């Protein structure tokens, strides 16, 4: 086929890759990274509560025997 037609075909499809999948991929990895860290922070706030509830239940288990 024609040579200059071949270059513009490649340019157009390459434009579609950058403007759609590659563009979306950049902002998704940014969101995914931030969401993973926020989840871990939530887990780290969660452990302190679970650690305190674990101590509170054991104290109640020992206090249920003395009553």
């Amino acid at each position: 086929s024609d040579t200059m037609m071949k270059f513009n075909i490649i340019r157009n499809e390459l434009h579609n890759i950058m403007n759609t999948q590659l563009k979306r991929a950049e902002s998704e990895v940014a969101a995914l990274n931030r969401r993973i860290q926020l989840l871990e922070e939530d887990l780290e706030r969660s452990e302190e509560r679970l650690g305190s509830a674990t101590a509170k239940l054991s104290e109640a288990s020992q206090a249920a025997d003395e009553s």
């Binding site: 086929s1 040579t3 071949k6 270059f7 075909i9 490649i10 499809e13 390459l14 890759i17 999948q21 590659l22 991929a25 998704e28 990895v29 995914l32 969401r35 993973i36 989840l39 939530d42 887990l43 969660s46 509560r49 679970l50 509830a53 509170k56 239940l57 109640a60």
Partner: protein, 69 residues
Amino acid sequence: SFLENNLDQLTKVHKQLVRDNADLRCELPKLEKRLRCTMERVKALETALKEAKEGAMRDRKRYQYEVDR
């Protein structure tokens, strides 16, 4: 009892974290697959460029032959 309301609230937080974790465990492999499908399209584009490059100088030796005559 306060402790049972506490555990019921903690249960609720974990239900949200389970759904947040399930979403992330679904998007990360999907994004790798989408990135892999992009690189296949780029590889096809790279071979299509080399086919166009050879076609361009097949035309450059043609223009030099339309001039030498």
